[PDB]
Paper text:
A prominent member of the PspA family is the vesicle-inducing protein in plastids 1 (Vipp1), also known as IM30 (inner membrane-associated protein of 30 kDa). Vesicle-inducing protein in plastids 1 (Vipp1) is critical for thylakoid membrane biogenesis and maintenance. Vipp1 appears to have two functions: in membrane maintenance (that is, during heat or light stress) and in thylakoid membrane (TM) biogenesis and/or remodeling. Vipp1 binds to negatively charged membranes and membrane binding depends on stored curvature elastic stress.
Using single-particle-based helical reconstruction, we resolved the structures of type I tubes at 5.1-Å resolution and two structures of type II tubes at 7.0-Å and 7.1-Å resolution. The type I and II tubes differ in their diameter and the arrangement of the monomers relative to the tube axis, as well as the diameter and thickness of the engulfed lipid bilayer tube. In contrast to the Vipp1 rings, the monomer orientation of the α1−α3 hairpin with respect to the tube axis is the same over the whole length of the tubes. Nevertheless, the monomer orientation among the tubes differs; in type I tubes, the α1−α3 hairpins are oriented parallel to the tube axis, while, in type II tubes, the hairpins are tilted approximately 45° relative to the tube axis. Remarkably, from rings over type II tubes to type I tubes, the α1−α3 hairpins accommodate a wide range of orientations along the tubulated membrane axis from perpendicular to parallel (from 90° to 0°) while essentially maintaining the same intermolecular contacts to stabilize the assembly. The here-determined structures of Vipp1 polymers in the presence of membranes indicated that helix α0 is immersed in the outer lipid leaflet of the bilayer. However, in contrast to SynPspA helix α0 that protrudes toward the bilayer, Vipp1 α0 lies flat in the membrane plane and appears to be partially submerged into the outer bilayer leaflet. The bilayer thickness in all three Vipp1 tubes remained nearly identical at 35 Å, although the inner leaflet radius changed with the tube diameter. Nevertheless, the same or similar intermolecular interactions of α0 with another α0 and α1 + α4, as observed previously in Vipp1 rings, are present in type I and II tubes.
Author numbering:
A (entry chain 0): 168 to 216
B (entry chain 0): 2 to 111
C (entry chain 0), D (entry chain 0): 2 to 56
E (entry chain 0), F (entry chain 0): 112 to 167
Amino acid sequence: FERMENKVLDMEATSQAAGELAGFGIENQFAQLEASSGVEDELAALKAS
Amino acid sequence: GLFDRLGRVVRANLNDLVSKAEDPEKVLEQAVIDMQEDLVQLRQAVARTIAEEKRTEQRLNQDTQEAKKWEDRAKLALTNGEENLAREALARKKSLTDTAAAYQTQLAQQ
Amino acid sequence: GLFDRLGRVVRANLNDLVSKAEDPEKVLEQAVIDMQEDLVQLRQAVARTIAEEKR
Amino acid sequence: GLFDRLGRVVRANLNDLVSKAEDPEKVLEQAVIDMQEDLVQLRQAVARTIAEEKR
Amino acid sequence: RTMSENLRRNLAALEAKISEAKTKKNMLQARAKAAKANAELQQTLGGLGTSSATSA
Amino acid sequence: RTMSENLRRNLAALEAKISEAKTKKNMLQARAKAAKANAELQQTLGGLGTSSATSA
């Protein structure tokens, strides 16, 4: 029975990939990266004052 | 009789009246919304497919580290001078290593 | 038969009448209030996740 | 169907009629009186917290 | 010792056939559900026919 | 002493498998509830489709 519940673990693993069939992936989170690196750049430029 | 082939052309008169309405998009929408409900299950099916692929992949990872454990208990045996236990561990790993190869082929098709 | 594809375009006539109403925000509100109830549980789920992380 | 998104905009018509009433304070009062009953227990909770701190 | 070792052949066969049948259960079930999706991909190539049915 | 020490192997195995199963219970339960939330994050990527259903 526990092993069947591990197949629910495989279902959640499927579900985290599933956004890609909906056209969501790393290309979305990549924006927050390009942004957050820019946030560190401007906070560094501020503290350089 | 000819009246049946006439039946196609009088239904084509109706088809002319409804074509003259010219609001085509409405069925385009119908088509794409029906496929969206399927698509969420379809991506789920892809995910299930990947999930068997993964459950197998972690298994193969678990196998290949367990194969090292038998080789490690064999290294202990070899360095101790316990070759009988090294050969027991040698049987265990070979059995595992071939099952690992089977899972590798199962993943390859997956 | 063609009458079914006509069914999409006559429902598009209705869609024109309701589009002509032009008060779009009301559904925008519906969308964001539904997600707020989920969001309080969603943050809770994040918190549960952190809670296992903490324990 | 479009009629559901129209449902948000016809409820927005009602929202316009009630906004036009312009007597906003009444709900401001509701909000602050509800929190006062909680606040007396909330300060009590702070006090309980301090009380364990004191004991 | 002679017949006992033949019992070890027999037991080695029992575990081999049973364990292999278990990996067949995984492979076949997975392949079956996967095949239902792949059949739906063929049907989705057929979905182009279902849109054609009013594209006219 | 010889067979008794094999009972110590056996007891060491009992506690090892049981204790590991207890940490699996924590990890799996946590991972399961977490996965329900992560599935709701995939669904929230799908929430963009639910708004699209009247954004038209």
